[PDB]
Nucleic acid binder design. Structure first.
Length: 394
RNA sequence: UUUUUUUUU
């Protein structure tokens, strides 16, 4: 199968170190019933999978009615949409042959081989069905967050695939076996691979690296009673001491963030061409789009960037021209008193996965200086390494 | 005597 590619996007095909590993994906699409592949983002996994499975012999495997076509599920609607104006142009075919579906935009075209999903739309489709005949190649995204809907869907697809791992008809050879790879976002999914519950077999796994684009991890053995002022001091020390760039100041809630915005408008009130060139912007997804496009833009000249954000920045929104974080130390979380029906908004330990993703959010392609207001001994006491499931709270 | 970071149909 050929793709009708383009020049700069063939530059985007070869550059990824997973396309040369295509044969593994080939055996992963030909040998194993369920495959688990992990890796940090930016290593060319979602931006390389449609070129795998459009060229795998699965677009027309069980042809001529097209029941072999890949659905790749995404954490959220904007991830699928942005990735569709990213890599549906990577396969050189129009919107009929590559597409997406989100909560309120359905692009159900019959020519399609690659479809980017959320969780809920595919739930909608296979409570509308139960045996998943129209699909044969499925790729999962974000296996490390372990949300509600990802876990729900993976349990019920384990049921459906292991029901179709059996014989389709009265002992045929034409089985509607479903080929599925979980393209993870961070490199610990083995907490599910050890179990014999969701699959009694051990699911075969593949581990791939990424491009670090280095970040310097720095621990401050400091009291973290008012982590706002500590983050303020670390970002002032980077802004004055270290070479220029952009620095991230991270917090938890609604009020400390605008308090830090007021302060960085106070001690650095100039923002035009105390000659510290600085533009300071808050960020969380409870802000309107005009401020959300204000951070999409680059800083005005005579001013660097500095972003006072909550814990949104790890996964929700990420911006190009930043270098360094000062972490939250402790992040805001929510839990329910099941003995009462009492909810809660509180602040507790950042797990090491969220902090690592945060440090990666700092050093996109440039140097990172992860000035952590907490210590290594406090990073010793940020167990567990990964975050706890979002199921257990609600 | 308001104290909502976050999310999937």
């Amino acid at each position: 199968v050929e793709v009708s590619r383009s020049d700069e996007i063939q530059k985007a095909r070869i550059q990824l170190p997973v396309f040369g590993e295509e044969h593994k994906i080939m055996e992963a699409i030909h040998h194993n019933d369920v495959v688990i592949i992990c890796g940090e983002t930016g290593s060319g996994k979602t931006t390389q999978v449609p070129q795998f499975l459009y060229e795998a012999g699965f677009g027309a495997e069980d042809s001529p009615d097209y029941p072999g076509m890949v659905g790749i599920t995404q954490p959220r609607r904007v991830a699928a949409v942005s990735m569709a104006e990213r890599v549906a142009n990577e396969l050189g075919d129009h919107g009929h042959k590559v597409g997406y579906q989100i909560r309120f935009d359905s692009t159900a075209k019959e020519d399609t081989k690659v479809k980017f999903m959320t969780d809920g739309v595919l739930l909608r489709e296979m409570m509308h069905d139960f045996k998943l005949t129209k699909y044969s190649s499925i790729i999962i995204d974000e296996a490390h967050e372990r949300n509600i809907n990802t876990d729900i869907l993976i349990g019920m697809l384990s049921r459906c695939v292991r029901l179709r791992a059996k014989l389709h008809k009265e002992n045929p050879i034409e089985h509607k076996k479903l080929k599925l790879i979980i393209m993870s976002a961070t490199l610990r999914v083995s907490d599910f691979s050890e179990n014999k519950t969701l699959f009694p077999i051990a699911p075969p796994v593949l581990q791939v690296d990424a491009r670090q684009f280095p970040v310097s991890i720095h621990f401050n053995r400091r009291t973290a009673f008012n982590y706002t002022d500590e983050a303020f001091r670390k970002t002032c020390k980077i802004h004055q001491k270290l070479p220029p760039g952009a620095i991230l100041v991270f917090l938890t809630g609604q009020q400390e963030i605008t308090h830090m915005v007021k302060r960085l408008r106070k001690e650095f009130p100039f923002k035009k061409n105390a000659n510290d060139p600085l533009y300071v912007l808050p960020l969380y997804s409870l802000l309107p789009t005009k401020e959300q496009m204000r951070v999409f833009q680059k800083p005005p000249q005579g001013s660097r960037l500095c972003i006072v954000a909550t814990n949104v920045a790890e996964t929700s929104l990420t911006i190009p021209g930043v270098r360094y974080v000062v972490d939250s130390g402790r992040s805001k979380e929510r839990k329910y008193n099941e003995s009462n029906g009492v909810q809660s908004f509180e602040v507790g330990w950042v797990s090491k996965a969220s902090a690592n993703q945060r440090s990666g959010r700092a050093g996109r392609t440039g140097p990172g200086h992860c000035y952590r207001l907490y210590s290594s001994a406090v990073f010793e006491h940020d167990f567990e390494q990964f975050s706890k499931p979002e199921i257990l709270r609600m």
